[PDB]
């Protein structure tokens, strides 16, 4: 059980679509990461040589999902900005070597505040780390060294503040659904 979420991207004729099994974290999404072979990625490589080198480097490294906690994560700003449906604010789209096309939509929503891969990528590239889940003792999570991975009560998540994990999941899934931007998957 997960949700597909569809973002609008400024100066781009298509939409961006992500899949996540953690919609409860959605208010902590601070950027999007697309696979180097994603249509958005090449449309931006058109006016970007750095991206052209990266996409080529990537077309070489057949990265394996299972070898990923081992490989050096690498990525490049696509220049495109996506609009967070609930928040309305702008979030960078990056192209990353750890996102593949073969399985999924080829784009992931990232919450560095609460996914370890997301934290490590955002640390390296000075991307924003937003806390949205509270520590088990009900305090603010310590995000100075690593991501808080635990499931828990949302804060700093606007209307979804105070919901435990299973409530958050549904409340955010239902919102994005009713907004015609999200879709549950069995
Ligand atoms: C906290 C988990 C994060 C959001 C991860 N990128 C996912 O969407 O599965």
From Swiss-Prot:
Coiled coil: none
Intracellular or extracellular location(s): Cytoplasm
Domain of life, per lineage: Bacteria
Complexes and interactors: Monomer.
Similarity comment text for this entry: Belongs to the class-I aminoacyl-tRNA synthetase family.
Record protein name field: Leucine--tRNA ligase
Organism, scientific name: Escherichia coli (strain K12)
Gene designation: leuS
Included stretch of the parent chain: 228 to 413 of 860
């Amino acid at each position: 059980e997960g949700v597909e979420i569809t973002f609008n991207v400024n100066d781009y004729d298509n939409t961006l679509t992500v899949y996540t099994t953690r919609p409860d974290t959605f208010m902590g999404c601070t950027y999007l990461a697309v696979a180097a072979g994603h249509p958005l990625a090449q449309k931006a490589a058109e006016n970007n040589p750095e991206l052209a080198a990266f996409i080529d480097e990537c077309r070489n490294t057949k990265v394996a999902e299972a070898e990923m906690a081992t490989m050096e994560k690498k990525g490049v700003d696509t220049g495109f900005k996506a609009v967070h449906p609930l928040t309305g604010e702008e979030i960078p789209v990056w192209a990353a070597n750890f996102v593949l096309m073969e399985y999924g939509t080829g784009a992931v929503m990232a919450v560095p505040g609460h996914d370890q891969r997301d934290y490590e990528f955002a640390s390296k590239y000075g991307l924003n780390i937003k806390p949205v889940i509270l520590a088990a003792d009900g305090s603010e999570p310590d995000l100075s060294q690593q991501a808080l991975t635990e499931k828990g009560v949302l804060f700093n998540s606007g209307e979804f503040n105070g919901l435990d994990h299973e409530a958050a999941f549904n409340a955010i899934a239902d919102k994005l659904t009713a907004m015609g931007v999200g879709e549950r998957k069995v």
